[PDB]
């Protein structure tokens, strides 16, 4: 995350971290339930084998709240392709149930229409992660969060050197130096409504990070609620 602030205690309980066999984080994920995690499809090809970490806020150590969970099933959206990065969504079923606690809780799944007419229409959303704090930086060691403004859809297409599909949405700043980055991919984009946070997007991609005239591209969660609901039953 570039800019933003540090995730204080209990602030981003739904944040999940995918770690490689070397125990290094490489992508984010969002807790949906005690068994399911929501992440980005392109994060899959990114690791031979991987596990999910929860309750972590600082990777340099173990404060006792962290918990590792092995993946039992990796449900990748079949239509996902790196050539367009469309359908960048994946659901993970964990082998063991997550224990909710301080810094460990799921985000709410909203209903399509309601989310689109009420959540997506909000002024801002919230993205978080342990990703790089700069375009050319290293994996951030502290969990960060950032309030990102929802961006006009047209103003979103006019700024992208790539195709923005219906399964995508822009969030961020035109010139202000704040945005998600590499490492935050797969992470949660949540929108708050009356102090309840609903998952609205999955950190997907961007041409660099915090680049003037560019935005962060997130996978619209509302476009996959059905697919997500079907993925969580099996």
């Amino acid at each position: 995350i570039v800019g933003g602030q540090e995730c204080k205690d209990g602030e981003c309980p739904w944040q999940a971290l995918l770690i490689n066999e070397e125990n290094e984080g490489f992508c984010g994920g969002t807790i949906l339930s005690e068994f399911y995690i929501l992440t980005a499809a392109h994060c899959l090809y990114q690791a031979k084998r991987f596990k999910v970490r929860v309750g972590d806020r600082n990777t340099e150590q173990e404060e006792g709240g962290e918990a590792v969970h092995e993946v039992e099933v990796v449900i990748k959206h079949n239509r996902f392709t790196k050539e367009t990065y469309d359908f960048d969504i994946a659901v993970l079923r964990l082998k063991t149930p997550i224990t909710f606690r301080m810094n460990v809780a799921p985000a709410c799944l909203p209903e399509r229409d309601w989310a689109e007419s009420t959540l997506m229409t909000q002024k801002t959303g919230i993205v978080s992660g342990f990703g790089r704090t700069h375009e050319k930086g290293r994996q951030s060691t502290r969990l960060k969060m950032l309030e990102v403004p929802y961006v006009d859809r047209n103003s979103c297409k006019l700024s992208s050197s790539f195709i923005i599909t219906q399964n995508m949405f822009c969030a961020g700043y035109d010139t202000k130096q704040e945005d998600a980055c590499q490492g935050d991919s797969g992470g949660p984009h949540v929108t708050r409504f009356k102090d309840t946070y609903f998952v609205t997007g999955i950190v997907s991609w961007g041409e660099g990070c915090a680049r003037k005239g560019k935005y962060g591209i997130y996978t619209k969660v509302t476009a996959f609620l059905k697919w997500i609901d079907r993925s969580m039953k099996t």
Partner: protein, 51 residues
């Protein structure tokens, strides 16, 4: 009108029979006034944790 401040619902809002019907996400039960959403157990989805 679900269009007016969300029909006073805590979470989900629908417009059936030309009225307003509130509902909640999994893990919450619809309160007596049929508007508020009450958490079923500790650590309900969508809430930052305090303990």
């Amino acid at each position: 009108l679900c269009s007016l401040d969300n029909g006073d619902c805590d979470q989900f809002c629908h417009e059936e029979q030309n009225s307003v019907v509130c509902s909640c996400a999994r893990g919450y039960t619809l309160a007596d006034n049929g508007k508020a959403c009450i958490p079923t157990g500790p650590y309900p989805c969508g809430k930052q944790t305090l303990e």
